[PDB]
């Protein structure tokens, strides 16, 4: 991977997303989607291992099918209204079609089996990229079309998203896999409030984003892929594993940490709109997230784990790659609750 | 100075096709801006009436618009005839 080639892949991915959240013509939205697709496949193949080839192939198939169904919705609402402008749909089945087309790109409904696997395949930096940047475009499209989305569809889809997100992560030790399942749960979390008011899903997107960088940067600052590998890191990096623990507390949403604020906001606006049964389901099922969160915490910091003899010469070497933004990345993802009113800035 | 000329000579010998292509290409972009006839080409393209010149409703005080298709005043393209 040529450094300059890697940079030009960075910015074509980012420009593909930018085209999505700045364009108005529907065709341009599709173009940005595949620009990002065509641009992110090579970086996922940076390591060039057969697992990476597997992950890239599954991503390609899923996202290509999803973009083709995206054009199907595109063509249908064009046919029934002759207007490429992105707005409320004028044909119902076109709206549904776009809903599953985007969802397959998000990993919400049973169209979510790709993400845990593809996260397993690629390197952790590619994992950060996949689970942070490749959500902004589909969320932005879903925000722009919130006028006419079948509320039943979006609600049930978010419900499965969070539910299988919680359940799938229980029996996973690979940190990449449990992070993928947690991201699926957060996907359900924001997409549940997507139909009602998009400011709150934007806020939850921001919090999940900052938490995800604050997470992945800690992982590859510890260089761990399995739970046992992270457990061995309780020694070398005690500060890193303590911050590991505090952000793992911010994971579930235990007050007064940052992660509680989006849950609180989403539930409060859901209750404003007579949806009282609905919020209790994610409120209960967040304990499923908190379960393997607590398991990760126990393996990381709360309980000392048996280290290794050779491991001691690691004591002689220091992490040289700075991996900047980590301090503020932690801080914004831990203590921003007294700043909840600032949500009105996004509105 | 000497290095640039020697490199041009070697390119003209080592890969002559490359220098010929690069030259004629480099002309292809810089002549149209320099040439004084591209505006005349724009005049050529605007001259052709693919559609009908739908007339304007006469109400008085448009001396510029000719009253008759044989009238002297109005747009003319004698430059087209001379060209």
């Amino acid at each position: 991977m040529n450094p300059i080639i890697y940079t030009t892949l960075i910015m074509t991915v980012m420009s593909g997303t930018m085209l999505v959240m700045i364009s108005s013509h529907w065709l341009l939205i599709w173009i940005g989607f595949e620009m990002n697709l065509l641009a992110m496949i090579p970086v996922l193949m940076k390591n060039f291992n057969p697992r990476a080839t597997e992950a890239a192939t599954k991503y390609f198939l899923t996202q290509a099918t999803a973009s083709m169904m995206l054009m199907m919705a595109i063509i249908i609402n064009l046919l029934y209204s002759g207007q490429w402008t992105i707005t409320k749909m004028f044909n119902p089945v076109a709206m549904t079609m776009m809903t599953m087309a985007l969802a397959m790109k998000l990993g919400l409904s049973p169209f979510h089996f790709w993400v845990p696997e593809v996260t397993q395949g690629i390197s952790l930096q590619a994992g950060l990229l996949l689970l942070t940047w490749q959500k902004l475009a589909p969320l932005s499209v879903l925000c722009q079309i919130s006028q006419s989305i079948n509320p039943n569809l979006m609600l049930t889809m978010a419900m499965l998203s969070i539910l299988i997100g919680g359940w799938g992560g229980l029996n996973q030790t690979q940190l990449r896999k449990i992070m993928a399942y947690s991201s699926i749960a957060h996907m359900g979390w924001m997409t549940a409030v997507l139909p009602y008011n998009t400011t709150m899903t934007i806020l939850n997107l921001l919090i999940y984003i900052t938490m995800t960088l604050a997470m992945f940067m800690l992982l590859i600052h510890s260089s761990a892929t399995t739970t046992l590998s992270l457990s061995h890191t309780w020694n070398k990096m005690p500060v890193i594993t303590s911050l590991m623990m505090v952000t793992l507390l911010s994971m579930g949403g235990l007050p007064p940490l940052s992660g509680f604020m989006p849950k609180w906001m989403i539930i409060q606006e859901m209750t404003k709109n007579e949806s009282i049964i609905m919020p209790t389901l994610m409120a209960m099922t967040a304990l499923l997230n908190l379960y393997f969160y607590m398991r990760l915490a126990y393996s990381s910091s709360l309980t000392m784990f048996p280290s290794t003899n050779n491991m001691k010469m690691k004591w002689q070497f220091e992490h040289t790659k700075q991996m900047k933004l980590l301090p503020t990345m932690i801080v914004l993802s831990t203590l921003v609750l007294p700043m909840t009113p600032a949500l009105s800035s996004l509105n | 100075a000497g290095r640039i000329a020697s490199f041009l000579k070697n390119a003209w010998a080592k890969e002559p096709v490359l220098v010929a292509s690069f030259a004629i290409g480099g002309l292809a972009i810089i002549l149209p801006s320099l040439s004084p006839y591209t505006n005349y080409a724009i005049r050529i393209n605007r001259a052709t009436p693919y559609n009908y010149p739908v007339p304007l409703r006469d109400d008085g005080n448009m001396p510029d618009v000719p009253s008759h298709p044989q009238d002297p005043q109005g747009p003319s393209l004698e430059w087209l005839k001379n060209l």
């Binding site: 959240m21 364009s23 108005s24 013509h25 002759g82 722009q144 006028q147 | -």
Partner: protein
């Protein structure tokens, strides 16, 4: 669009093609130019959930 840079910084980037009553090449009108002119100028500055 989400972040409409088009009218902020002041240029058309894609709005030329969005609808078919725009300035078509050599004034070739669409099939439903009159109807969509009526519809667009009907619903202008009204609000989608009110203009529908």
């Amino acid at each position: 669009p989400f972040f409409d840079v088009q009218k902020r910084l002041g240029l058309d980037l894609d709005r030329w093609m969005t609808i078919q009553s725009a300035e078509q090449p050599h004034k070739i009108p669409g099939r439903c130019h009159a109807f969509e002119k009526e519809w667009i100028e009907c619903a202008h500055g009204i609000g989608g959930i009110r203009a529908e």
